[PDB]
Design a protein around this ligand. Structure first.
Ligand code: CLR
Ligand code: CLR
Ligand code: CLR
Ligand code: CLR
Ligand code: PLM
Ligand code: PLM
Ligand code: SRO
Lengths: 238, 338, 294, 57
């Protein structure tokens, strides 16, 4: 029955041909860092995606920094029932969270974003996943606060009891009110993230604009820091 | 107008529950007491399939009981020869986030889908011998959770938009749409005759649907948590479900209610997959705690346990001939148990 | 007193137990095996076990019996094995520190890809073979004794009695070169790598503390870990390798008791290594707990 | 609003569901037992087959 031997040879050569391709794909898979992009539709998430590029449920994007490949997947076009498909991204290096910091006085979109951040951070399957929090639309926030018509003092009553941290590093010429509002918004999310106190994952807030070209560098630095902190915690260095 | 209809809904629930209670005089446990127990089922790893780069989330058995298809989140849809362990094919998916895969009963086609909201049909044995996307069944507004072939031209799919659909593959359009589910639909199961299929959903209810007539015959609400898995009893008169409730429930279409439950004090995690042996006596289910518990379908006692996986067991499937049961896990390996 | 027999035997037993536990935990835990970083730790554990089985017992026999009975050829073989395994363990520690520094500071984002099997094999080959060129090649040919042969004869016997014992003496060139190759260069590399790791950990902890203060509802851990590791390494080896540098330059006047104490301080390193690089690692602690659960 | 239409469809579907014929639970259990016993002899997992017949040896 030489037919058995011929079929065995064919099966093994096919197996080796497939195995070499799998090995080749393995190097690119490990060399790449996967990212999950989240945020409300009205946020500047789409503009950030467009900048990094320059009706499916997943819009994947390809971008490289310092010869490091990053695969970001916008989960847009998905329904608000997030508790199921979110489990798929438990192994992503970081979750990029985009929030319109200027949308505090719109519905209460900022409060909804805070609740979403709480739910994602406290998610059972995302315990070891860090979050890159992009506080987007900073220019709009500055425009709205500088005008003086903003009533943020009672939309978030804790603001009146809040003052700029001593560690703040405002940009040159930045108005004191703009800095105070920015850091209040940032601390609102930091309160949610800091509550864990476990160190398995960390939040990396940033003050970014929708067309900010450095957002790619922010993502690269955040991924590098996340990996460094994971390694340090592995060796009891954190 | 609206108020009367809502009260009628509660009255309808009341009569349905009263009838279901009246149909219950004894439980399956009570009648099964005198039957000889199955005993301790012994099974250990038989074949280890390697090659998937990322966590495996779905698999299916071919009707020949030799060819096996599995899908991984890395974007690789691999077809394995279970007897020889050789990888027949390694299909590169357009979208890496595949959540379901299916193998046609004749073996000519393979289906897969996930967060891409598209079910991709692959022709395995075209005259050129190259695997290619025959057609894309777009139209769903949610991630595809499960899919199963009715034939080479028909396939039923479940999606995150709370609706299941029957697709005519050649035309690429929904022959029929199922919208009775209120929550996310997670799993599908075809009846042996293919005349009926039952879909579990995150609304904790299981619904029995008619393929040709496009309506749900019955609704089962025994579970109180998201249903992740569902499978018919081999005769087609009953089905079992898996859910995050950390318990399995068996339902009979004719009884129109839960028959019996499978649970233990040492299990607290959710259930990912469920399957039945050829005779239906053994109920095999995958659990989030990295092992699969084998349950006596009649007694609901732990007849055996499969623990050859280092991560979440995402999928489970028994061969049509009953020779072996394959299990996938997030550890990127398939373990075949006999 | 014969109490030293209990102490040396206990040290040997603890070292062997620790190394065997490390190796079996790595082997059983298939999730540890997939990480190439664990390969360096496995090699270090094997080297320490080899020390504890082929070097420590022979030194203990030499001490308790105070006499060598296996001949000068096996004296040379024992000295070469001691030097080889000691330098292999030191090089394993240095390579572990360098790999950790690489992963943390140099290539954190592509560490997994850069750690190809070729790199791991080359590093382990450097750790295991380079000691051969300084342990067996010079000692078997007697290059360490040339120029001080007359002094060795005086030190060879305590001729007031008929006792004879195996000896190891080094001339100025061999002493300096071997000390530099085995301890000082690896010590400097470890110091630099761990200082850079400390700087990275300090900046990360400062950022974490700033964020925690910002999120408050009203940094020294890396220092402690690195201090523990480097203090253990220094207390184990620096005294011996400083004596070896100064011993030839003072007409070999160092008393034998100090030499033995420093030699066994060096040996203790192999017993401490299982409890330093595995205990201070989250994955190894998880594996050890799993094994203890049985 | 679509609430009225949704309620009407819901009541129609529940009315369809209620009208089905339901058979005794003990009868269903007996049928399942009959199927299990009739095929227990042909279930390799329930009763392991000998090594010679098993294709995985
Ligand atoms: C559990 C296994 C897979 C861990 C693998 C770690 C590898 C790197 C370890 C395990 C056994 C080790 C080998 C054991 C024996 C020796 C003999 C020694 O004279 C030279 C090094 C050498 C050849 C070691 C090299 C490194 C080694 C191969
Ligand atoms: C990593 C590499 C450099 C390790 C190898 C170091 C080698 C080259 C060193 C270690 C011991 C050294 C020898 C030690 C003793 C002496 C006696 C001296 O009168 C002439 C040189 C000579 C013969 C040295 C030659 C170089 C030597 C063999
Ligand atoms: C072999 C014997 C002499 C080793 C004794 C350990 C000495 C050399 C070690 C212990 C602590 C170490 C210091 C700790 C950290 C610093 C800060 C920075 O400036 C780098 C070097 C420096 C200054 C190190 C130099 C070497 C050092 C002083
Ligand atoms: C990490 C290291 C630097 C710690 C210090 C090591 C010390 C304990 C070592 C280094 C040099 C050694 C000295 C070398 C020379 C002699 C002369 C001898 O007649 C008595 C012992 C004595 C005095 C040694 C004592 C121990 C010693 C001082
Ligand atoms: C004389 C020094 C020799 C050093 C040899 C180094 C060997 C490196 C091996 C890298 C990891 C190999 C893992 C698979 C081992 C196996 O096949 O069992
Ligand atoms: C061992 C070589 C590398 C260096 C690593 C150890 C660094 C030791 C630093 C000592 C000073 C620590 C001061 C801490 C003060 C505090 O607790 O706030
Ligand atoms: N017991 C220490 C053996 C040893 C390792 N390396 C050495 C270098 C020089 C020396 O004399 C001795 C050694």
């Amino acid at each position: 029955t030489e037919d058995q031997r011929n079929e065995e040879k064919a099966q093994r050569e096919a197996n080796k041909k497939i195995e070499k391709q799998l090995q080749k794909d393995k190097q690119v898979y490990r060399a790449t860092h996967r990212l999950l992009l989240l945020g409300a539709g009205e946020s500047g998430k789409n503009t950030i995606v467009k900048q990094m590029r320059i009706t499916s449920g997943i819009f994947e994007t390809k971008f490289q920094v310092d010869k490091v490949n990053f695969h970001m997947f916008d989960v847009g076009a998905q329904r608000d029932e997030r508790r199921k498909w979110i489990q798929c991204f438990n192994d992503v290096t970081a979750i990029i969270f985009v929030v319109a910091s200027s949308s505090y006085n719109m519905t209460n979109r900022l409060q909804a974003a805070l609740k979403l951040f709480d739910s994602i951070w406290n998610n059972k399957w995302l315990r070891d996943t860090s979050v890159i929090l992009f506080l987007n639309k900073q220019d709009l926030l500055a425009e709205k606060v500088l005008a003086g018509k903003s009533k943020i003092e009672d939309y978030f009553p804790e603001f009146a009891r809040y003052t700029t941290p001593e560690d703040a590093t405002p940009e040159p010429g930045e108005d004191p009110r703009v800095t105070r509002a920015k850091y209040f918004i940032r601390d609102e999310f930091l309160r949610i993230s800091t509550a864990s106190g476990d160190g398995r994952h960390y939040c990396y807030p940033h003050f970014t604009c929708a067309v900010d070209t450095e957002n790619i560098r922010r993502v690269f630095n955040d991924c590098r820091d996340i990996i460094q902190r994971m390694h340090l915690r592995q060796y009891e260095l954190l | 107008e609206l108020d009367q209809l809502r009260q009628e809904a509660e009255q309808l629930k009341n009569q349905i529950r009263d009838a279901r209670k009246a149909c219950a005089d004894a439980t399956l446990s009570q009648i099964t007491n005198n039957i000889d127990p199955v005993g301790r089922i012994q099974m250990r790893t038989r074949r280890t399939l390697r090659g998937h780069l990322a966590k495996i989330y779905a698999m299916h058995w071919g009707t020949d009981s030799r060819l096996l298809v599995s899908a991984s989140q890395d974007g690789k849809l691999i077809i394995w020869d279970s007897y020889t362990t050789n990888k027949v094919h390694a299909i590169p998916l357009r979208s890496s986030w595949v959540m379901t895969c299916a193998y046609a009963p004749s073996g000519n086609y393979v289906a897969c889908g996930g967060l891409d909201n598209i079910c991709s049909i692959y022709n395995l044995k075209t005259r050129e011998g190259n695997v290619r996307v025959s057609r894309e069944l777009a139209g769903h507004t949610g991630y595809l959770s499960c899919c199963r072939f009715l034939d080479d031209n028909q396939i039923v799919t479940s999606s995150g938009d709370t609706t299941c659909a029957l697709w005519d593959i050649e035309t690429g359009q929904q022959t029929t749409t199922f919208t009775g589910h209120t929550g996310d639909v997670m799993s599908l199961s075809l009846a042996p005759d293919t005349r009926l299929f039952v879909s579990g959903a995150c609304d904790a209810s299981a619904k029995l649907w008619d393929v040709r007539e496009g309506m749900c015959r019955q609704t089962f609400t025994g579970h109180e948590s998201d249903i992740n898995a569902i499978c018919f009893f081999p005769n087609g008169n009953a089905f079992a479900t898996g859910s995050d409730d950390a318990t399995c429930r068996l339902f009979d279409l004719r009884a129109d209610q839960e028959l019996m439950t499978y649970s233990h004090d040492n299990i607290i995690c959710g259930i990912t997959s469920v399957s039945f042996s050829k005779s239906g006596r053994l109920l095999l289910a995958g659990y989030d705690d990295f092992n699969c518990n084998v349950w006596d379908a009649l007694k609901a006692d732990r007849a055996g346990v499969l623990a050859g996986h280092d991560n979440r067991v995402s999928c489970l499937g028994v061969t049509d001939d009953g020779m072996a049961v394959a299990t996938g896990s997030w550890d990127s390996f398939l373990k075949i148990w006999n | 007193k014969v109490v030293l027999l209990t102490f040396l035997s206990t040290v040997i037993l603890m070292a062997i137990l620790g190394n065997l536990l490390v190796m079996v935990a790595v082997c059983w835990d298939r999730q540890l095996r997939k990480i190439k970083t664990n390969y360096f730790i496995v090699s270090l554990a094997f080297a320490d076990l080899l020390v504890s089985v082929l070097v420590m017992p022979f030194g203990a026999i030499e001490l308790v019996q105070d006499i060598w009975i296996y001949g000068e050829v096996f004296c040379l073989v024992r000295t070469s094995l001691d030097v080889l395994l000691t330098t292999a363990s030191i090089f394993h520690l240095c390579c572990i520190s360098l790999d950790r520094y690489y992963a943390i500071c140099c290539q954190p984002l592509v560490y997994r890809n850069k750690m190809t099997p070729l790199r791991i094999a080359l590093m382990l080959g450097g750790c295991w073979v380079i000691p051969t060129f300084i342990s067996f090649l010079p000692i078997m040919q007697g290059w360490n004794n040339i120029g001080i042969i007359d002094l060795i004869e005086k030190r060879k016997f305590n001729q007031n009695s008929n006792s004879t014992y195996c000896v190891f003496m080094v001339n100025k060139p061999y002493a300096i070169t071997c000390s530099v190759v085995a301890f000082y260069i690896p010590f400097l590399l470890m110091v630099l790598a761990y200082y850079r790791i400390y700087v990275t950990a300090k900046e990360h902890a400062h950022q974490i503390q700033m964020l925690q203060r910002a999120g408050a509802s009203s940094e020294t851990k890396a220092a402690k870990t690195l201090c523990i590791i480097m203090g253990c390494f220094c207390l184990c080896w620096a005294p011996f390798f400083v004596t070896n540098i100064v011993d030839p330059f003072i007409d070999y006047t160092v008393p034998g008791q100090v030499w033995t104490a420093f030699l066994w301080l060096g040996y203790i390193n192999s017993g401490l290594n299982p409890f330093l690089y595995a205990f201070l690692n989250k994955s190894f602690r998880r594996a050890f707990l799993i094994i203890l659960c049985c | 609003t679509a609430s009225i239409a949704q309620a009407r469809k819901l009541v129609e579907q529940l009315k369809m569901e209620a009208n089905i014929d339901r058979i005794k639970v003990s009868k269903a259990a007996a049928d399942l037992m009959a199927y299990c016993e009739a095929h227990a002899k042909e279930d390799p997992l329930l009763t392991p087959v000998p090594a010679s017949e098993n294709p995985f040896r």
